Coordinates of all heavy atoms in Angstrom, one line a residue:
Chain B
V355 N -40.9 51.0 58.8 CA -41.1 49.8 58.1 C -40.4 49.9 56.7 O -39.7 48.9 56.3 CB -42.6 49.6 57.8 CG1 -42.8 48.4 56.9 CG2 -43.3 49.4 59.2
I356 N -40.4 51.0 56.0 CA -39.8 51.2 54.8 C -38.3 51.0 54.9 O -37.6 50.3 54.2 CB -40.1 52.6 54.2 CG1 -41.5 52.6 53.5 CG2 -39.0 53.0 53.2 CD1 -42.1 54.0 53.4
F357 N -37.7 51.6 55.9 CA -36.2 51.6 56.1 C -35.8 50.2 56.6 O -34.7 49.8 56.1 CB -35.8 52.7 57.0 CG -35.6 54.0 56.3 CD1 -36.3 55.1 56.6 CD2 -34.6 54.1 55.2 CE1 -36.2 56.3 55.9 CE2 -34.5 55.3 54.6 CZ -35.2 56.4 54.9
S358 N -36.6 49.6 57.4 CA -36.2 48.2 57.8 C -36.2 47.3 56.6 O -35.3 46.4 56.4 CB -37.2 47.7 58.9 OG -38.5 47.7 58.4
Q359 N -37.3 47.4 55.8 CA -37.3 46.5 54.6 C -36.1 46.8 53.6 O -35.5 45.9 53.1 CB -38.6 46.7 53.8 CG -39.9 46.3 54.6 CD -39.7 44.8 55.1 OE1 -39.1 44.6 56.1 NE2 -40.3 43.9 54.4
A360 N -35.8 48.1 53.5 CA -34.7 48.4 52.6 C -33.4 47.9 53.2 O -32.5 47.4 52.4 CB -34.6 50.0 52.5
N361 N -33.2 47.9 54.5 CA -32.0 47.4 55.1 C -31.9 45.9 54.9 O -30.8 45.4 54.5 CB -32.0 47.7 56.6 CG -30.8 47.1 57.3 OD1 -29.8 46.9 56.8 ND2 -31.0 46.8 58.6
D362 N -33.0 45.2 55.2 CA -33.0 43.7 55.0 C -32.7 43.3 53.6 O -32.0 42.4 53.3 CB -34.3 43.1 55.5 CG -34.4 41.6 55.3 OD1 -33.5 41.0 55.8 OD2 -35.3 41.2 54.7
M363 N -33.3 44.1 52.6 CA -33.0 43.8 51.2 C -31.6 44.1 50.8 O -31.0 43.3 50.0 CB -34.1 44.5 50.3 CG -35.5 43.9 50.4 SD -35.5 42.1 50.5 CE -37.2 41.8 50.2
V364 N -31.1 45.2 51.2 CA -29.7 45.6 50.8 C -28.7 44.8 51.5 O -27.5 44.8 51.1 CB -29.5 47.1 51.1 CG1 -29.1 47.3 52.5 CG2 -28.5 47.7 50.1
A365 N -29.0 44.1 52.6 CA -28.0 43.2 53.2 C -27.5 42.1 52.3 O -26.3 41.8 52.2 CB -28.7 42.5 54.4
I366 N -28.4 41.6 51.4 CA -28.1 40.4 50.6 C -27.0 40.7 49.6 O -26.0 40.0 49.6 CB -29.3 39.9 49.9 CG1 -30.2 39.1 50.9 CG2 -28.9 39.0 48.7 CD1 -31.4 38.4 50.2
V367 N -27.1 41.8 48.9 CA -26.1 42.1 47.8 C -24.8 42.3 48.4 O -23.7 41.9 47.9 CB -26.6 43.2 47.0 CG1 -27.0 44.4 47.8 CG2 -25.5 43.7 46.0
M368 N -24.7 43.1 49.5 CA -23.4 43.3 50.2 C -22.8 42.1 50.7 O -21.6 41.9 50.6 CB -23.6 44.4 51.2 CG -22.6 44.3 52.4 SD -23.3 43.4 53.8 CE -24.5 44.6 54.4
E369 N -23.6 41.3 51.4 CA -23.0 40.1 52.1 C -22.6 39.0 51.1 O -21.6 38.3 51.3 CB -23.9 39.6 53.2 CG -25.2 38.9 52.6 CD -25.1 37.4 52.5 OE1 -24.0 36.9 52.7 OE2 -26.1 36.7 52.2
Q370 N -23.3 38.9 50.0 CA -23.0 37.9 49.0 C -22.0 38.3 48.0 O -21.7 37.6 47.0 CB -24.3 37.4 48.3 CG -25.2 36.5 49.1 CD -26.5 36.2 48.4 OE1 -26.7 36.6 47.2 NE2 -27.3 35.4 49.0
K371 N -21.5 39.6 48.2 CA -20.4 40.2 47.4 C -20.7 40.3 45.9 O -19.9 40.8 45.1 CB -19.0 39.5 47.6 CG -18.8 38.1 47.1 CD -17.9 37.3 48.0 CE -18.6 37.0 49.4 NZ -20.0 36.4 49.2
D372 N -21.9 39.8 45.5 CA -22.4 39.9 44.1 C -23.8 39.4 44.1 O -24.3 38.9 45.1 CB -21.5 39.1 43.2 CG -21.3 39.7 41.9 OD1 -22.1 40.6 41.5 OD2 -20.3 39.4 41.2
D373 N -24.4 39.5 42.9 CA -25.8 39.0 42.8 C -25.9 37.5 42.9 O -27.0 36.9 42.7 CB -26.3 39.5 41.4 CG -26.7 40.9 41.3 OD1 -26.7 41.6 42.4 OD2 -26.9 41.4 40.2
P374 N -28.7 44.0 41.7 CA -27.6 44.9 42.0 C -28.0 46.3 42.3 O -29.0 46.8 41.8 CB -26.8 44.8 40.7 CG -27.8 44.5 39.6 CD -29.0 44.0 40.2
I375 N -27.2 47.0 43.1 CA -27.5 48.3 43.6 C -26.3 49.2 43.1 O -25.2 48.9 43.3 CB -27.6 48.4 45.1 CG1 -28.2 47.1 45.7 CG2 -28.5 49.6 45.5 CD1 -29.6 46.8 45.3
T376 N -26.7 50.3 42.4 CA -25.7 51.3 41.9 C -25.2 52.1 43.1 O -25.9 52.3 44.1 CB -26.2 52.1 40.8 OG1 -27.0 53.2 41.4 CG2 -27.1 51.3 39.9
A377 N -24.0 52.7 43.0 CA -23.5 53.6 44.0 C -24.3 54.8 44.2 O -24.5 55.3 45.3 CB -22.0 53.9 43.7
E378 N -24.9 55.3 43.1 CA -25.8 56.5 43.2 C -27.0 56.1 44.1 O -27.4 56.9 45.0 CB -26.3 56.9 41.8 CG -25.2 57.4 40.9 CD -24.6 56.3 40.0 OE1 -24.8 55.1 40.4 OE2 -23.9 56.6 39.0
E379 N -27.6 54.9 43.9 CA -28.7 54.5 44.7 C -28.4 54.5 46.2 O -29.2 55.0 47.0 CB -29.2 53.2 44.3 CG -30.3 53.2 43.2 CD -30.0 52.2 42.1 OE1 -29.4 51.2 42.3 OE2 -30.5 52.4 40.9
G380 N -27.2 54.0 46.6 CA -26.8 54.0 47.9 C -26.6 55.4 48.4 O -26.9 55.8 49.6
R381 N -26.1 56.3 47.5 CA -25.9 57.7 47.9 C -27.2 58.3 48.3 O -27.3 58.9 49.4 CB -25.2 58.5 46.7 CG -23.8 58.3 46.6 CD -23.0 59.2 47.6 NE -21.7 58.6 48.0 CZ -21.5 58.1 49.2 NH1 -22.4 58.1 50.2 NH2 -20.3 57.6 49.5
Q382 N -28.2 58.2 47.5 CA -29.5 58.8 47.8 C -30.2 58.2 49.0 O -30.8 58.8 49.8 CB -30.5 58.9 46.6 CG -30.0 59.6 45.4 CD -29.4 58.7 44.4 OE1 -29.8 57.5 44.2 NE2 -28.3 59.1 43.8
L383 N -30.0 56.8 49.2 CA -30.6 56.2 50.4 C -29.9 56.7 51.6 O -30.6 57.0 52.6 CB -30.5 54.7 50.2 CG -31.3 53.9 51.3 CD1 -32.7 54.4 51.4 CD2 -31.3 52.4 50.8

Side-chain angles (χ1 to χ4, degrees):
Chain B
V355 176
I356 281 159
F357 274 117
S358 59
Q359 294 309 80
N361 175 32
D362 178 57
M363 286 321 191
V364 86
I366 282 187
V367 49
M368 149 265 288
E369 68 98 351
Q370 287 179 358
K371 65 215 71 48
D372 219 338
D373 284 351
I375 329 295
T376 79
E378 296 91 344
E379 268 135 28
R381 281 280 151 249
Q382 302 93 40
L383 191 45

